[PDB]
Curated annotation (Swiss-Prot):
Residues represented out of the complete protein: 16 to 415 of 520
GO BP field: bile acid biosynthetic process; bile acid catabolic process; lipid catabolic process
Description of how activity is regulated: Inhibited by diphosphate.
The enzyme's E.C. designation: 6.2.1.7
Record's protein name: Bile acid--coenzyme A ligase
Temperature-activity profile: Optimum temperature is 50 degrees Celsius.
Organism of this sequence: Clostridium scindens (strain JCM 10418 / VPI 12708)
Pathway participation: Lipid metabolism; bile acid biosynthesis
UniProt key word Lipid metabolism: yes
Length: 393
């Protein structure tokens, strides 16, 4: 069939990340998949990425890491981290990332709460099935089949950390046409755009951006030095076309001496999420790149909902965080649970996209859900006549 997912050489709509990696590497085996700046630069082709992650999955499989297993991953932003994730998922296991700078008490708390079965880490954690350093993953690979293990689902695919709270994604990793299209409409990401990653891979947003980027055949550029002047140089030098960032980074980049439209001209889309972006900072970026290039996603508290808004809509609805994505709905309600008129202030109830409905805060009791699938955390705001949502405080 002829899929919106242009690499899908197969028969089903839904494709796992490993199968998608296979398809992409068949189409362009020797193009660069990941570029890593460490000054020191390393690269890996789609074909190597595919082959090494398959070899590493066979090692997981021999060690009985699979569905039901949880693999803690504490590599920094590196090729090896990327390989590890694909290998974990190719084996059906659940990926659990944390900072490579996590403190000992946090590692201890995470192990004592989740009880992971293995790990990728530079410092050896006792009592696990294995604990491989970044150098050791190549040794674990040596000798193993270059063919991917037979395709399989990894559910849950991830547990992530935000004293500590753990969020578990009870759905298999991968995407279908509808979810790719929808990701592309909310983020501005298209097919075959060089992406620069400037968030840590253990955060949820940068995780999505990197692996949805690789899923779409985009080359991923990773950097360890997140100094703004450096980031800007990397944008130019690699002709970056897509970048996701937090508002803090947008604020610093806009303040660099000299900067202007021309420095960012390679960009097709800038996506921002994961912190308040003031109207001032938004206007500055709309003026730097053009309003159709600024994409924003606002994920509500506790996953009750997700909105998005593009810069040209934001100029027409200034202050808004967008409209609920896809088939999601928002309902602004008064103190008796009744929906109100446009511009009236009340509690924000929302329905959630598919993926959020099967996302769980571990050891936290879920929210009350009203009829239609509506939840609230008590946020206060309003909608305008076109359904754009605004916060009051």
């Amino acid at each position: 069939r002829d899929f919106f997912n242009k690499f899908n050489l197969g028969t089903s709509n839904f494709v796992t990340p490993g199968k998608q990696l296979e398809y992409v590497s068949e189409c362009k085996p020797d193009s660069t998949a990941v570029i890593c700046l460490d000054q020191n630069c390393s690269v890996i082709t789609w074909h190597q990425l595919h082959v090494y992650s398959s070899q590493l999955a066979w090692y997981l499989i021999e060690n009985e890491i699979g569905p039901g297993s949880i693999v803690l991953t504490m590599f920094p932003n590196s090729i090896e981290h990327i390989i590890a994730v694909f290998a974990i998922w190719k084996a059906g296991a659940c990926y659990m990332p944390m900072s490579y700078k996590a403190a000992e008490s946090e590692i201890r708390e995470a192990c004592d709460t989740i009880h992971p079965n293995a790990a990728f880490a530079e410092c050896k954690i006792p009592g696990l099935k294995f604990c491989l350093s970044a150098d050791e993953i190549y040794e674990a690979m040596e000798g193993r089949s270059k063919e991917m293990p037979s395709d399989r689902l990894a559910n849950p695919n991830m547990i992530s950390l935000s004293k500590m709270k753990f969020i578990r994604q009870n759905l298999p990793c991968g995407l279908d046409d509808e979810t790719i299209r929808s990701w592309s409409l909310m983020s501005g990401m298209g097919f075959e755009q060089r992406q620069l990653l400037v968030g840590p891979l253990f955060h949820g947003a940068p995780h999505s951006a990197a692996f949805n980027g690789l899923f779409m055949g985009n080359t991923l550029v990773l950097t360890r030095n997140l100094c703004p002047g450096n980031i800007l140089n990397m944008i130019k030098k690699y002709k970056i076309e897509f970048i996701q960032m937090v508002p803090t980074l947008m604020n610093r980049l806009a303040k660099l001496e000299g900067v202007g439209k021309e420095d960012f001209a390679s960009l097709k889309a800038l996506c921002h999420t994961g912190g308040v972006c003031s109207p001032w900072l938004k206007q500055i970026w709309i003026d730097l790149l053009g309003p159709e290039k600024i994409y924003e996603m606002y994920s509500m508290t506790e996953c009750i909902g997700l909105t998005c808004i593009r810069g040209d809509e934001w100029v027409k609805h200034p202050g808004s965080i967008g409209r609920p994505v896809g088939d999601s709905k928002v309902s602004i309600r008064d103190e008796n649970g009744k929906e109100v008129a446009p511009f009236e202030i009340g509690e924000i109830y929302m329905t959630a996209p598919a993926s959020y409905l099967v996302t769980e805060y571990i050891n936290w009791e879920p929210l009350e859900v009203k009829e239609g699938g509506f939840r609230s955390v008590g946020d206060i705001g309003y909608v305008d006549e076109q359904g754009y949502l605004y916060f009051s405080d």
